[model samples]
Target chain A: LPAMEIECRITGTLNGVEFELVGGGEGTPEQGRMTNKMKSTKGALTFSPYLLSHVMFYHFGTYPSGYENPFLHAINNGGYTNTRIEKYEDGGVLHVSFSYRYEAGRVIGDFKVMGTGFPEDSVIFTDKIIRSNATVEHLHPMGDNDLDGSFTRTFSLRDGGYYSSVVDSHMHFKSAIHPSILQNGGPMFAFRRVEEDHSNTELGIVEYQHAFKTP
Target chain B: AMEIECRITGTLNGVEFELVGGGEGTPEQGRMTNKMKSTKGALTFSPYLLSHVMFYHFGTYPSGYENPFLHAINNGGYTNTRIEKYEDGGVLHVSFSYRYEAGRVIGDFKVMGTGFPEDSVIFTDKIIRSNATVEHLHPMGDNDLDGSFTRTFSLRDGGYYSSVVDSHMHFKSAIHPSILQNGGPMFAFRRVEEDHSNTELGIVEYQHAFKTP
Candidate 1:
């Protein structure tokens, strides 16, 4: 079994506006930062037991078009695009582009390719996993705003080991999204990518059990 | 503006540990090098905080699985860790102490010049819980634990170090209340990577806070 955590800091443009935002802080969006309790629609880890077994059979090779993968699934669902996979003798890398509407403006960016190297050579025991829970600060009112609330996720495998990546990015729009407020860049983003092994933990065990249970 | 944090690496008993202090998050709760949930953003009193001083077999819980009730933040915490200008140069010193019993305390909190035994200790102090004030003191956790001691060293270019960490613990247990300690190198590498400067927002805020009447 294996689990991974990622925190990153990204400096980029969103909708032709400059911005710098940070993740893993305790605060509200208006405060210029968001808590670690946010999740991304494009960067979710939704690997089913079927996909897990399929990747194991493929042994870290490129999957077919109809395969069940987190990046592919997101690409099909929308908001995530530009799917690219690099192949290597031992493993491969997966890259996906994303763009979506946050609270005040839109987010258009890409995550650091899924695995460290293109086509990571590790055994494909698990495909990917999603965060199960999250906690946001309600001290302020965020209407219909899907802030990156879920910061942590879990994964599992049979024998070989696997790794997962996330692009947890946050932004603060100096003002409402408009050309008028574009004097010194529109928004500042705090993009983070955190990685760590999630093996032998209680939550990891629980997620591992859940992955094997098929309908 | 730039900020600094420190990390230490060392081995005690037999377990390898990495103790970190002086970084973002709640000031009193203390910081850990493990980068687990607690250390990532906010600092709290959780056994899952990953003991920098003890191992899983030592009754301390492993990373992410510390018992909540038994191990509280006050049970042991990082106290006065300082890096300041001493004499013409700068000094790096950290004190880590933990309670072992109702009246006894132990930890590795020392001061030294260099590796040479002839070098005199720059400073020295003991965290003694001998008075009623200390007994009544409220640490992160209500309980007191064991104690440990560490030797200190000197750094010529000390002003560069923006962090100084000191840890102590007082826990209440069923048996001989032990303390907590952190294991790591003598000092953290010069500075953190540029990617960690997530506090740029402060600059924007600082600029925004200025107004002329």
Candidate 2:
């Protein structure tokens, strides 16, 4: 159960309903400061939903499109316990643990991430990048048929080790058996990982290990 | 096993449509969805657990990857499902909402799919959109259920044609290619010529024994 200091931002779209989440664990779970560390220091992890026709389904017209973020609110205000972080193949399979309680049940799970097209490590820390693209194979087991999708991630590195990642993906459910809203043509997400400013947090760059290739 | 009938009533394409289902399994005591509004919606019956099977158990790793979707759809305590609206003539919408109060994980997703058409109706899926949300009641432990998935389907036509074809496609996510291709026909749907209006085709029967290795 190794931990990596991260500022993760994730956006998921199936068909057309857009789900956006931003926030990352910057400190180790042992310390009491992992909560809200991203929001307090790094800018807000914008949890905005750009729901098209589904605007009324979830909110019942109570909130408009691009509504205020509550999932981020829960993350920023949540405590970090029973957390696990495992990075395989540099960041190819980034499995980060997460949990939260809603009106009914608690959303308890980890982000199953598969990243491809990583820029050379030597060049990553050397220059400030505007855009470096990669492929993200996102896998989720929520419904009957697994909600599997692939998106192109645009990554940029700013000065001071700050990284920005944006991804736009699309899928077509050509039949009635496909879940949710019908025919989602667009869904995108962006993530920015800010450099650690705190003096005590020294969980530096993760060592790349190909566990997936091994066991 | 005693036969059970499950009916989900909602509007499809601005017209009233009822999804009727009958199977060998008995209907459990609880109503998956009890207080659903006409507009609450139901997602097309997609297998929630099969995805987990493909991702973790059978597809990639022997130990496999970990995912919430890999787990059952129900959150253990109180779960509700609704058929919101199938509007715009062809765009069908549905929802499966759940509530978990206790700590330990508890829930099961035995089946998910729409009712059969009494008179055959042709549906070609033009688009598909969906969203998944989880809220923290205690805000304890990890606070993110964030992940995404990608799938390239094997079948050219994504919708259902006959019960056997659709069932094969639905189980494709979980079954290995060797098993699916070699022993698939054993698990097909047998059409009961007699009228079982609630069933998919007359009376479509599931041959679960076909899955046995």
Candidate 3:
């Protein structure tokens, strides 16, 4: 089971910013900064789950486009992040908590390569909490931790099918990092190569079971 | 509901630091020196969140950082998180406590930029961050407050922090401003690389402030 990649069907609600404005506690609450609220504005973990999975995967998994890894590009260039991964499985139930503090980094899959060090992230400095789900799995983080055919999953939104894709069937989160889906969790949206276009828009069509941390 | 961002409550914002002792060199960091005392952008508390949220009607719910409920501002007021560097010189300290108060609000609240490179512009090395204690109580439109009780909770670290008053009138911050820059309980760090320094040395009696009732 450890050697063979587990085929998991990831489906869950995608919580976070679309492109990345990076919350600096700027503008107003209605403006976005404090947007990505998972459950309740008070009790729920308010954060960019998509962004988290993005960075975690990029760290451990070697993507086809190594140079395309945004989080890696940032950290290597002086940009920094303080990541803490607290994982525990109790009573056959899995628990994974992530603590991230990002300064600046590149946006993965941007065709224009856009400007680097964007989507300024610093919730860690603004909010007095970890800002994440206790056991929410969006993208499968397998092939990490030990390495071996790791980070190998097929994510396709089914042409002409609008929104609906199957990326991580089941995975073992390897590390805390991003853009390689570096914070690898939820769904791994494949940019479909150099073009970097989307198969669908961010709407409520249903059937979303994302995998963040698990077997 | 009881909103508070625009209430006439005291406020404080902006950061500063100073040098005190150290330079002896011995055993254990807190003792072997006493050289650096750093204070991050002294963050002040404002009666701002719930009222602001309700002001803009940002959905319907409550929000918290790593721990406590949040109601704070980005600028104005005085909040000094002095670092009492445990090491003698060119080193770092991870804890300390202080009281913050202010009168007359600054034109704008400047939230410090965090991280490595640009971080130096926002934070300084030389003291322990967790040991920091902040309070925002008084009655100065721009900065300053009155008698406020200071209590130490059993648990707290990076997950969350404390500052001052709140809504429902349950917690009342004296004469202040319209922006609820009261308790923005946020969990932050000093960046591993910025935890130590070379010249920034010593610790001084630190101070911070906040209010209630």
Candidate No. with top TM-score: 2
Q: Best candidate per DockQ, number?
A: 1
lDDT of each: 0.22, 0.23, 0.21
Query: DockQ of each model against the real complex?
Result: 0.03, 0.03, 0.01
Give the Å shift of residue A89 in candidate 2: 28
Could you arrange the candidates by DockQ from highest to lowest?
1, 2, 3
Taking the tens digit of each residue's C-alpha lDDT, what string does model 1 give over A68-173? 2222123223322222232322343333222322222223232332333423334432333322211110010011111111111112233222232221222222
Tens digit of per-residue lDDT, candidate 2, span B11-40 = 432445344333332112111111111123
Residue range A5-25, candidate 3, lDDT tens digits: 111111222122123222111
Candidates' RMSD to native? 20.4, 21.3, 20.9
Q: Estimate each model's TM-score.
A: 0.23, 0.24, 0.20
lDDT tens readout by residue for model 3, B1-213: 211121111111222332232222111111111233323332222111111111111111123211111122222223322111111121111111112223211111112211223222112321222222222222223233221111111111111111121111112233223223332211111001112343342222212111110
Clash counts for all predictions: 79, 51, 124
Any runs in candidate 3 off by more than 4 Å, and if so which? A1-215, B1-98, B103-213
Per-residue lDDT of candidate 2, residues A1-215 (tens digit): 23324443333332222333444443232221222221212232111111100010000001113322122223333422222222222242222223333222122222222223333462232334433322222222212322222222223334312232222222211222122211232211211122222211111211111100001
When 2 and 3 are scored with TM-score, the better candidate is 2
For residues B55-168, what per-residue lDDT tens digits would candidate 1 score against the true structure? 111122223333222243334433333222222233333344333333222233322222212222221111111100000011233233222111112123211111112233
